[PDB]
Design an enzyme around this catalytic site. Sequence first.
Site, PDB file in Angstrom:
ATOM      1  N   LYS A 144      39.624  30.696  31.904  1.00 21.08           N
ATOM      2  CA  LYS A 144      39.831  29.405  31.262  1.00 21.08           C
ATOM      3  C   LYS A 144      39.601  28.274  32.227  1.00 21.08           C
ATOM      4  O   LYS A 144      39.652  28.460  33.465  1.00 21.08           O
ATOM      5  CB  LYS A 144      41.220  29.358  30.615  1.00 21.08           C
ATOM      6  CG  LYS A 144      41.199  30.055  29.260  1.00 21.08           C
ATOM      7  CD  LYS A 144      42.446  29.949  28.524  1.00 21.08           C
ATOM      8  CE  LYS A 144      42.334  30.804  27.291  1.00 21.08           C
ATOM      9  NZ  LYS A 144      43.616  30.879  26.516  1.00 21.08           N
TER      10      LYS A 144
ATOM     11  N   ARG B  28      45.471  39.066  27.705  1.00 19.56           N
ATOM     12  CA  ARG B  28      44.233  39.029  26.941  1.00 19.56           C
ATOM     13  C   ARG B  28      43.106  38.559  27.864  1.00 19.56           C
ATOM     14  O   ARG B  28      43.060  37.374  28.278  1.00 19.56           O
ATOM     15  CB  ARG B  28      44.400  38.133  25.731  1.00 19.56           C
ATOM     16  CG  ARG B  28      43.078  37.882  24.955  1.00 19.56           C
ATOM     17  CD  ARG B  28      43.318  36.871  23.855  1.00 19.56           C
ATOM     18  NE  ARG B  28      42.111  36.657  23.051  1.00 19.56           N
ATOM     19  CZ  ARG B  28      41.124  35.857  23.404  1.00 19.56           C
ATOM     20  NH1 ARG B  28      41.168  35.243  24.583  1.00 19.56           N
ATOM     21  NH2 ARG B  28      40.089  35.665  22.601  1.00 19.56           N
TER      22      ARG B  28
HETATM   23  C1  LIG Z   1      41.894  33.758  20.077  1.00 19.40           C
HETATM   24  N1  LIG Z   1      42.006  33.124  21.401  1.00 19.40           N
HETATM   25  C2  LIG Z   1      40.905  32.335  22.034  1.00 19.40           C
HETATM   26  C3  LIG Z   1      41.277  31.804  23.415  1.00 19.40           C
HETATM   27  C4  LIG Z   1      40.323  30.939  24.236  1.00 19.40           C
HETATM   28  C5  LIG Z   1      39.065  31.549  24.874  1.00 19.40           C
HETATM   29  C6  LIG Z   1      37.934  31.161  23.891  1.00 19.40           C
HETATM   30  C7  LIG Z   1      38.703  30.759  26.181  1.00 19.40           C
HETATM   31  O1  LIG Z   1      39.228  33.022  25.182  1.00 19.40           O
HETATM   32  N2  LIG Z   1      42.505  32.003  24.001  1.00 19.40           N
HETATM   33  C8  LIG Z   1      43.484  32.725  23.374  1.00 19.40           C
HETATM   34  C9  LIG Z   1      43.250  33.314  22.025  1.00 19.40           C
HETATM   35  N3  LIG Z   1      44.234  34.047  21.429  1.00 19.40           N
HETATM   36  C10 LIG Z   1      45.447  34.215  22.024  1.00 19.40           C
HETATM   37  N4  LIG Z   1      46.438  34.905  21.419  1.00 19.40           N
HETATM   38  N5  LIG Z   1      45.705  33.722  23.247  1.00 19.40           N
HETATM   39  C11 LIG Z   1      44.832  32.981  23.952  1.00 19.40           C
HETATM   40  O2  LIG Z   1      45.171  32.528  25.049  1.00 19.40           O
END
Ligand SMILES: CN1CC(CC(C)(C)O)=Nc2c1nc(N)[nH]c2=O
Lengths: 270, 270
Positions: free
Chosen positions: A216, A250
Amino acid sequence: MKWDYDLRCGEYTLNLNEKTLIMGILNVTPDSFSDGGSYNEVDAAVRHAKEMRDEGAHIIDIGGESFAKVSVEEEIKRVVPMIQAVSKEVKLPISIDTYKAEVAKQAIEAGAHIINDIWGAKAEPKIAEVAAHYDVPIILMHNRDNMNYRNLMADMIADLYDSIKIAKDAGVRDENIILDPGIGFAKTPEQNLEAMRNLEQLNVLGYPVLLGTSRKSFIGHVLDLPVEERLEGTGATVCLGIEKGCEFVRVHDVKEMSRMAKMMDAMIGK
Amino acid sequence: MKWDYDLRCGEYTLNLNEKTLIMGILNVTPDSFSDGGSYNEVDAAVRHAKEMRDEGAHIIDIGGESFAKVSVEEEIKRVVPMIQAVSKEVKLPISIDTYKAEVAKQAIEAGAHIINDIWGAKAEPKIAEVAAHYDVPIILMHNRDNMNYRNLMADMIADLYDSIKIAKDAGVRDENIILDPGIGFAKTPEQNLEAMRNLEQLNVLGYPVLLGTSRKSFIGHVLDLPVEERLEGTGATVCLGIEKGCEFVRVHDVKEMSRMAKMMDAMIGK
Ligand SMILES: CN1CC(CC(C)(C)O)=Nc2c1nc(N)[nH]c2=O
Ligand SMILES: CN1CC(CC(C)(C)O)=Nc2c1nc(N)[nH]c2=O
C-alpha cells in the site's frame, strides 16, 4: 487458548489459535474482449490460486473490481466463473471481495465461503442479510467518505462498532464477524502509521482482526519505493500486526509473508 | 527522547533516537596462500563494505575469525589490514569482532571504533581495560559455556550484569556500554525464541541493546529452511526486536533489513 471457537467456512475450518492465517490476493486481470468466463482469464486465476495454495495461503480473496468499468451485472459475470473454477480446483476457502449485496449472494451461490466488505455493511446494509442467511463469515472493514477524525482510533472503533450493529441487527452471529482497520482507506499516510502503532486497541471489541497492508502507498511514502519494491515494507507491517494480535493478513507476496508470519508466530508463542 | 546522549565513535557519532542503527556484517573470506593483507582479500572486503555503506549500513562489523585456523598473531595480521583499508575507504564506524584484548588493541590502533565482544569481557577481562583506555564503545554479548538455566531471562540479565561490572570496574563509562542478548549462543532453539519473546526485559538494565539474529539456525529450525533461505525469518526477528526496543541490528542482508527497520521505525514512532 484465545479463541474458543473456529471459523466455520462450510467444508473448511480455520483455527484462530494455531497460526496467522494468510489471505492471498487473487490477481484478477480481465480479458479485454470478453464479458467474463473466458479461458485465458479463468485459467490465469486458477494457476495463480494454485501457486498461492502452494506458497502457504489459507484463504483466496477474489474481487469483481480492482481494468474496464463494469456494472453490478458485469461484476457478477466476471467473478462467478472464477469462484466456480478456483473452488473446484483449489481446496481453500474463498472470500468474495465486494460491498454489494447481490454480488455477495451470487458469489456464495457460486462457491465463496467468506464475504469481504471494504464498506463494513455500510454501502449496502442488505449484504449483512446475505451474510446472515448463508451463515458465512463476513469481514467488516473500517472505511468512511472523509478523513475528519476527532480522534483516529476512537473514531475507527466507533465506526467499526456501527458496522457490527448493522451485521448483528441483520442476524449475523458474533462468530461470523471479523474486523479490519481498513489501512489505506480514509486515512492519511500519518493516520495509517498511527493505526498500525495502535492496532492492539481493536482487540477490545472481541473479534478476530484481519490486516491488509500489502504494497500500500503508506509504505511507499515511508520508504520512497514504488509498488514493486514494497516487500520489506509489507513484511514490517505484517510483523507488527501479528505482534499486535491480528488473526489474518491479506497479502500479495504469499511465499514471503507466510515465512515471516510463521517466524513471528514461533516467537510470540502462537 | 529515550537516550540523553549519542554514541561517540571518535570521528563519527550515532544518534540512538533517530532510527535503528544497522550493523553490517563484513564478509571476510581469507586468501588460502597468505598471512593476511593480500590484495584479493582486502579489495573484496572494501568492495563489500562499500556495497553495505550504499545499502544503508551505519556500522561495519569486522572479524578476525568466523576458513583456516589462526593464532592471535595470525588473527591480527588478517584483521589489521582490512580495518586500515575499510576505514580509509568507507566513512562509517567500524566494530572489531573479537573477545581478545590484544586483537582489540591493534584493531583500534588500526582504526576500529567499537569493540564487539561475544564473551562480554569474560574470556579476556583485560579487553575492558582496552575499551576503558581508548574510550571506545564496547558491546557485551550474553554468552556462557553451558545451557543450565534456572530461569533463562533472569539468568541472562544476571550474566549481562556480571559483564557490566567487569567493564565498569575497568573504568568503562556507562555511555560506552551496549548490551546484546547473544541469540544463538548457549541457547537451545526454544531458548532463542524465548529470549526474542522477552527481549524488552533487557531494557531495565538502562543500556542500548544490539540484536544479532541474522540467518541463525533457530530461524532454520522454525522455518526448516537452509541458511540462504533465511531472509524473511531474519526480517521477522529484526521487526520484533525493533518493536521490543533494540537500538542496533547486526545483519548480513543490509539492503533488505534497512528497509524493514525503516518501516518498523516509522510505525513505532522512532
Ligand atoms: C478488498 N480490499 C482491497 C484493498 C486495497 C488494495 C487494492 C491496495 O489491495 N485493501 C483491503 C481489501 N479488503 C480488506 N479486507 N482489507 C484491506 O486492507
Ligand atoms: C560476532 N558475532 C558472531 C555471531 C554469529 C554469526 C557467526 C552466525 O553471525 N553473532 C553475533 C556476533 N556479535 C554480536 N554482537 N552479536 C551476535 O549476535
